[PDB]
Amino acid sequence: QLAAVDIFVSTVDPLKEPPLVTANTVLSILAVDYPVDKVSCYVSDDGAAMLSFESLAETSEFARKWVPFCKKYSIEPRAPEWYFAAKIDYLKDKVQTSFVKDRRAMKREYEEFKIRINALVSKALKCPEEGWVMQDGTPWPGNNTRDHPGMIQVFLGQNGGLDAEGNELPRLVYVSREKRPGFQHHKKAGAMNALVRVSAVLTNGPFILNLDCDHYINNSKALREAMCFLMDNRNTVFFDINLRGLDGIQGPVYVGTGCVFNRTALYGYEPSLEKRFGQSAVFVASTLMENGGVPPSATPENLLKEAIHVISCGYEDKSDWGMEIGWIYGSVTEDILTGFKMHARGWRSIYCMP
Ligand SMILES: [Mn+2]
């Protein structure tokens, strides 16, 4: 069977992380050969850059065309830039097939997509003074980069409008955690932790996968192959049920990038209310769930509220986050801010892609 997966991408600066490359990674994620309902893509933008937000909006709109195309004709890789670079043998066909016209159409619409991304970049290339204004008319909450409220925006998924074939697409969530003067944010680490919490509130998939913003998925089946190991040259795998003391794997394991791993390993918990996890009833509830998921009773809105709450600024204060929970904040000794901490304690599984 196929378990839900939450996929994290972290970006920080559109000027060293070109929006188009991020777009291609995201498009490779949204087109993944896996049940649409059970794959979700969270994109932390630590820079709160409207260029990124809009590029992401654009990306989702293009995904509406690109994803059904890929699934219909079994395309790989499912990141457009690298797909259209693979040379094709047109000579082998006597006449234009339906595939190649679908595809010439598609490439054209992708080149148009690129053009509007370039437009966004260039438009951004010199600061307006009164700050950026949304296509709405309301001011952009991210303009003050070290001083701005939490932002979450969900694209696609169940109420983000179908693809070109009337089918739904995976959730695509924009997240920019609160930044305030006087609070540390611990960089990518504090970002991964906040994404753990947000994803827990919105979807709560039993597995997590963290990809760099330039790591596009090579093979649309990557998640299925991973599940072929996670539930009963070569790549990195790890499985452990650790009862026990002295036998087997001792202590924590640290997982970085490109690896599907089980969520609950993050959480401590030997087989109490205690806010070790910070104060959010919804979140700890989520940590106490068998096979992940949210209570369907909750409505998209008020859980959007608690999702904004778990990325507030000082949520982690007086909590184990960054200390013994999640991605671990460094410069003391641990030699981390390099991975998610998987506690020995209980069930642990990792499948990494090549
Ligand atoms: Mn802190």
From Swiss-Prot:
Positions of UDP-alpha-D-glucose binding: 10, 16-17, 46, 187
Annotated consequence of substituting residue 258 to E: In cev1; reduced amount of crystalline cellulose in roots
Binding site for Mn(2+): 188, 212
Coiled-coil intervals: 100-124
Segments in the Cytoplasmic topological domain: 1-354
Knockout consequences: Mutants cev1 are dark green and contains more jasmonates and ethylene, that leads to shorter and thickened hypocotyls and roots, with prolific root hairs, and the accumulation of purple anthocyanins. They exhibit constitutive and high expression in leaves lamina of vegetative storage proteins (VSP1 and VSP2), basic chitinase CHI-B and plant defensin PDF1.2. In addition, this mutation confers resistance to powdery mildew pathogens such as E.cichoracearum, E.orontii and O.lycopersicum, to the bacterial pathogen P.syringae pv maculicola, and also to the green peach aphid M.persicae.
Modifications made to the protein after synthesis: Palmitoylated, in part by PAT24/TIP1.
Localisation per UniProt entry: Cell membrane; Golgi apparatus membrane
Active site annotation, chain numbering: 46, 335
Tissue: Expressed in young plants, flowers and roots, and to a lower extent in leaves and stems. Localized in all cells except meristematic cells. Accumulates particularly in root caps, root hairs, epidermal layer, midveins of leaves and anthers. Not present in old tissues.
Family: Belongs to the glycosyltransferase 2 family. Plant cellulose synthase subfamily.
Subunit structure: Homodimer. Interacts with CESA1 and CESA6. Interacts with STL1 and STL2, but not with GOT1. Binds to CSI1 and CSI3. Interacts with PAT24/TIP1.
Protein's job: Catalytic subunit of cellulose synthase terminal complexes ('rosettes'), required for beta-1,4-glucan microfibril crystallization, a major mechanism of the cell wall formation. Involved in the primary cell wall formation, especially in roots.
Protein name in the entry: Cellulose synthase A catalytic subunit 3 [UDP-forming]
Gene source species: Arabidopsis thaliana
Gene behind the chain: CESA3
From-to range in the entire protein, with total length: 334 to 784 of 1065
